[PDB]
Design an enzyme around this catalytic site. Structure first.
Site, PDB file in Angstrom:
ATOM      1  N   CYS A 348       0.775  -1.239   0.000  1.00  0.00           N
ATOM      2  CA  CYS A 348       0.000   0.000   0.000  1.00  0.00           C
ATOM      3  C   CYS A 348       0.811   1.296   0.000  1.00  0.00           C
ATOM      4  CB  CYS A 348      -0.953   0.016   1.194  1.00  0.00           C
ATOM      5  SG  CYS A 348      -2.018   1.467   1.034  1.00  0.00           S
ATOM      6  N   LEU A 349       0.624   2.099  -1.045  1.00  0.00           N
ATOM      7  CA  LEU A 349       1.323   3.375  -1.159  1.00  0.00           C
ATOM      8  C   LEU A 349       0.700   4.414  -0.234  1.00  0.00           C
ATOM      9  CD1 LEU A 349       1.991   3.857  -4.972  1.00  0.00           C
ATOM     10  CD2 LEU A 349       3.639   3.322  -3.205  1.00  0.00           C
ATOM     11  N   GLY A 350      -0.546   4.185   0.178  1.00  0.00           N
ATOM     12  CA  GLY A 350      -1.202   5.148   1.042  1.00  0.00           C
ATOM     13  C   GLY A 350      -1.206   4.791   2.512  1.00  0.00           C
TER      14      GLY A 350
HETATM   15  C1  HEM Z   1      -6.517   1.336   6.177  1.00  0.00           C
HETATM   16  C2  HEM Z   1      -6.329   1.737   4.899  1.00  0.00           C
HETATM   17  C3  HEM Z   1      -5.743   1.053   3.836  1.00  0.00           C
HETATM   18  C4  HEM Z   1      -5.635  -0.296   3.631  1.00  0.00           C
HETATM   19  C5  HEM Z   1      -5.988  -1.411   4.612  1.00  0.00           C
HETATM   20  C6  HEM Z   1      -5.079  -0.465   2.309  1.00  0.00           C
HETATM   21  C7  HEM Z   1      -4.759  -1.696   1.744  1.00  0.00           C
HETATM   22  C8  HEM Z   1      -4.191  -1.893   0.479  1.00  0.00           C
HETATM   23  C9  HEM Z   1      -3.793  -3.188  -0.053  1.00  0.00           C
HETATM   24  C10 HEM Z   1      -4.053  -4.523   0.628  1.00  0.00           C
HETATM   25  C11 HEM Z   1      -3.107  -2.968  -1.216  1.00  0.00           C
HETATM   26  C12 HEM Z   1      -2.421  -3.985  -2.160  1.00  0.00           C
HETATM   27  C13 HEM Z   1      -3.411  -4.860  -2.925  1.00  0.00           C
HETATM   28  C14 HEM Z   1      -2.746  -5.743  -3.973  1.00  0.00           C
HETATM   29  O1  HEM Z   1      -1.644  -6.278  -3.709  1.00  0.00           O
HETATM   30  O2  HEM Z   1      -3.335  -5.909  -5.060  1.00  0.00           O
HETATM   31  C15 HEM Z   1      -3.113  -1.527  -1.404  1.00  0.00           C
HETATM   32  C16 HEM Z   1      -2.531  -0.877  -2.496  1.00  0.00           C
HETATM   33  C17 HEM Z   1      -2.589   0.504  -2.720  1.00  0.00           C
HETATM   34  N1  HEM Z   1      -3.162   1.423  -1.862  1.00  0.00           N
HETATM   35 FE1  HEM Z   1      -4.025   1.117  -0.098  1.00  0.00          FE
HETATM   36  N2  HEM Z   1      -4.834   0.774   1.699  1.00  0.00           N
HETATM   37  C18 HEM Z   1      -5.245   1.710   2.638  1.00  0.00           C
HETATM   38  C19 HEM Z   1      -5.206   3.112   2.421  1.00  0.00           C
HETATM   39  C20 HEM Z   1      -4.765   3.753   1.250  1.00  0.00           C
HETATM   40  C21 HEM Z   1      -4.866   5.190   0.988  1.00  0.00           C
HETATM   41  C22 HEM Z   1      -5.318   6.287   1.950  1.00  0.00           C
HETATM   42  C23 HEM Z   1      -4.473   5.392  -0.287  1.00  0.00           C
HETATM   43  C24 HEM Z   1      -4.457   6.640  -0.927  1.00  0.00           C
HETATM   44  C25 HEM Z   1      -4.921   6.837  -2.194  1.00  0.00           C
HETATM   45  C26 HEM Z   1      -4.070   4.085  -0.801  1.00  0.00           C
HETATM   46  C27 HEM Z   1      -3.431   3.867  -2.027  1.00  0.00           C
HETATM   47  C28 HEM Z   1      -3.012   2.630  -2.525  1.00  0.00           C
HETATM   48  C29 HEM Z   1      -2.376   2.459  -3.819  1.00  0.00           C
HETATM   49  C30 HEM Z   1      -2.045   3.549  -4.823  1.00  0.00           C
HETATM   50  C31 HEM Z   1      -2.129   1.147  -3.939  1.00  0.00           C
HETATM   51  C32 HEM Z   1      -1.550   0.436  -5.147  1.00  0.00           C
HETATM   52  C33 HEM Z   1      -0.070   0.143  -5.016  1.00  0.00           C
HETATM   53  C34 HEM Z   1       0.441  -0.755  -6.127  1.00  0.00           C
HETATM   54  O3  HEM Z   1      -0.395  -1.299  -6.885  1.00  0.00           O
HETATM   55  O4  HEM Z   1       1.678  -0.919  -6.236  1.00  0.00           O
HETATM   56  N3  HEM Z   1      -4.285   3.080   0.135  1.00  0.00           N
HETATM   57  N4  HEM Z   1      -3.781  -0.861  -0.370  1.00  0.00           N
END
Ligand code: HEM
Ligand SMILES: CC1(C)[C@@H]2CC[C@@]1(C)C(=O)C2
Ligand SMILES: [K+]
Ligand SMILES: [K+]
Length: 405
Positions: A348-350
Site C-alpha cells: 500500500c502506497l497510502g
Molecule cells: C486502512 C487503509 C488502507 C488499507 C488497509 C489499504 C490496503 C491496500 C492493499 C491490501 C493494497 C495492495 C493490494 C494488492 O496487492 O493488489 C493496497 C494498495 C494501494 N493502496 Fe491502499 N490501503 C489503505 C489506504 C490507502 C490510501 C489512503 C491510499 C491513498 C490513495 C491508498 C493507495 C493505494 C495504492 C495507490 C495502492 C496500489 C499500489 C500498487 O499497486 O503498487 N491506500 N492498499
C-alpha cells in the site's frame, strides 16, 4: 450458486466460501472470513462461488503468493473474473518489472512527504468534525465522520470538488461491494468518463494537486500518456475512498463496545500508535488476488494457468499461526504480524496517509469524547467484498462527559 467443479480441482479441497456474502457474516465480517481457518480447513481451498476460485487461508501461503509475481500475476486481481479482466488500474494491474516506473510516480503523489504536507489540514478537519459532533451526544459515525474525514482529505489532495463525493463514492463502492446495480466494468467506465476532461484540463493548465502531478508527470524519464494518467488517477481515487473509511468504522465500533480499551488510551495516550497497528491487524479488511500465469504446483496443489486465487490480506494477521489469540485486541501485543496493507511489490502506497488519519482520529476523538457507546439495541451490520465495511454505526454519549479543546 456453484460453478461446476473444474476437472483439476480435488473434491476434498472444495470449501464454498462466498467473499461477497460469507455465511457467518452476522458474527462480524472478520469472524465470517475466519471460518476459513477453522480446525479442519486446508491451507488452500477452492470455492465454487463467484465463478469458482482458489483461496489461500493462511498467512504463510498468502505472503508467498504475493511475493511470487512470476506465478501469481496481478493482471487479473479481482474476483469475479469479469471484474478482474476489466480491471486495468495502474500500477495495481501490472507486475514487476513493468510495474515500477508507474508505482514510483504514484508514490510521489501520496507518499510520506505528501502526508507531512497534509498534517495540519488533516488535524484541523479531524478536530472541526469531532467538536461539531461533541455537544449533540450522538452521531451516525459512518456518514458523520468515517466518510467525510478521509474522503475530504483525499479530495483536497486531488484538487476535486467535495460535491463530487456522492457520485465517486457510489462508483467506488460498486467496484468493492457491488449492490448489483452496476458491474465493475460499468463503474470503471463511469470513473474514467469523470476523469478524462479533468485530466485534459490539468495537462493544459498544470496545478499542484495529485491529478495534475500525475497527468503531467514522467514515467522513468518519458512523458505519461493521457490514458495512463487516467488509469492511475482512477486507482488513486478508489484507494482513497473506501479502505480508511471502513477501517475507522471497524475500529470505533470496537472501541464503543470496549470501555477498558478506551481507558487504556485515555490514561496512556502514548500507546495510540501501537493501538493503531493492533487495530489494523484485528480489523484488517481487504482481500483481492492474483491469476496464475502458468500451471504450477503450490503446496501440493496443482494450479492451472488462468486459475484465480484470492489471497486475503485480511487473513494473515488473523491467522493463529502468526498471532496467538488472534481475535483478541491487545494494544501491548509484542509482535503485531499482518499484511493489512498488502505484501510484496504492491505494498500500500497510502499506508502512511492511512496511519496518520487513524492516529489523529483516535487522538482527537478520545480527547473530546472519551466515553461513548453504540446506540441501544443497534444491530451492527457488516458487508463483505474486495474491501469489507460497516453499513452503519450509530453512536451515543452524554455531552456532560465530553471535553472541548
Ligand atoms: C486502512 C487503509 C488502507 C488499507 C488497509 C489499504 C490496503 C491496500 C492493499 C491490501 C493494497 C495492495 C493490494 C494488492 O496487492 O493488489 C493496497 C494498495 C494501494 N493502496 Fe491502499 N490501503 C489503505 C489506504 C490507502 C490510501 C489512503 C491510499 C491513498 C490513495 C491508498 C493507495 C493505494 C495504492 C495507490 C495502492 C496500489 C499500489 C500498487 O499497486 O503498487 N491506500 N492498499
Ligand atoms: C485492493 C485495493 C484496496 C487497492 C487500492 C484500491 C483497491 C480496491 C484496488 O483495486 C488496489
Ligand atoms: K475435480
Ligand atoms: K485485467
Amino acid at each position: 450458486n456453484l460453478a461446476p467443479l473444474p476437472p483439476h480441482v480435488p473434491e476434498h479441497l472444495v470449501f464454498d466460501f462466498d467473499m461477497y456474502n460469507p455465511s457467518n457474516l452476522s458474527a462480524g465480517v472478520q469472524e465470517a472470513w475466519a471460518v476459513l481457518q477453522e480446525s479442519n480447513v486446508p491451507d488452500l481451498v477452492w470455492t465454487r462461488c463467484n465463478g469458482g476460485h482458489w483461496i489461500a487461508t493462511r498467512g504463510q501461503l498468502i505472503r508467498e503468493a504475493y511475493e511470487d509475481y512470476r506465478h501469481f500475476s496481478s493482471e487479473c486481481p479481482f474476483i469475479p473474473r469479469e471484474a478482474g479482466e476489466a480491471y486495468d488500474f495502474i500500477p495495481t494491474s501490472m507486475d514487476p518489472p513493468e510495474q515500477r516506473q508507474f508505482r514510483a510516480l504514484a508514490n510521489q503523489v501520496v507518499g510520506m512527504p505528501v502526508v507531512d504536507k497534509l498534517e495540519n489540514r488533516i488535524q484541523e478537519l479531524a478536530c472541526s468534525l469531532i467538536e461539531s459532533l461533541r455537544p449533540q451526544g450522538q452521531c451516525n459515525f459512518t456518514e458523520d465522520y468515517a466518510e467525510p474525514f478521509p474522503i475530504r482529505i483525499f479530495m483536497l489532495l486531488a484538487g476535486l470538488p467535495e460535491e463530487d463525493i456522492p457520485h465517486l463514492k457510489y462508483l467506488t463502492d460498486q467496484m468493492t461491494r457491488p449492490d448489483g446495480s452496476m458491474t465493475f466494468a460499468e463503474a470503471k467506465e463511469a470513473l474514467y468518463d469523470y476523469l478524462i476532461p479533468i485530466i485534459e484540463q490539468r495537462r493544459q493548465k498544470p496545478g499542484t494537486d495529485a491529478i495534475s502531478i500525475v497527468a503531467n508527470g514522467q514515467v522513468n524519464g518519458r512523458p505519461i500518456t493521457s490514458d495512463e494518467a487516467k488509469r492511475m488517477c482512477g486507482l488513486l481515487l478508489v484507494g482513497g475512498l473506501d479502505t480508511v473509511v471502513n477501517f475507522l468504522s471497524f475500529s470505533m465500533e470496537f472501541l464503543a463496545k470496549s470501555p477498558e480499551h478506551r481507558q487504556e488510551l485515555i490514561e496512556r495516550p502514548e500507546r495510540i500508535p501501537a493501538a493503531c497497528e493492533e487495530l489494523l491487524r484485528r480489523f484488517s479488511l481487504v482481500a483481492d488476488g492474483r491469476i496464475l500465469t502458468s500451471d504450477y504446483e503450490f503446496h501440493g496443489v496443482q494450479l492451472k494457468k488462468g486459475d484465480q486465487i484470492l489471497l486475503p490480506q485480511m487473513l494473515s494477521g488473523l491467522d493463529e499461526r502468526e498471532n496467538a489469540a488472534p481475535m483478541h485486541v491487545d494494544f501491548s501485543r509484542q509482535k503485531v504480524s499482518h499484511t493489512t496493507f498488502g505484501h510484496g511489490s504492491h505494498l500500500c502506497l497510502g499506508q502512511h496517509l492511512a496511519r496518520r488519519e487513524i492516529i489523529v482520529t483516535l487522538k482527537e476523538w478520545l480527547t473530546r469524547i472519551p466515553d461513548f457507546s453504540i446506540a441501544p439495541g443497534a444491530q451492527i451490520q457488516h458487508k463483505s467484498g474486495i474491501v469489507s465495511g460497516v453499513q452503519a454505526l450509530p453512536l451515543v454519549w452524554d455531552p456532560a462527559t465530553t471535553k472541548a479543546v
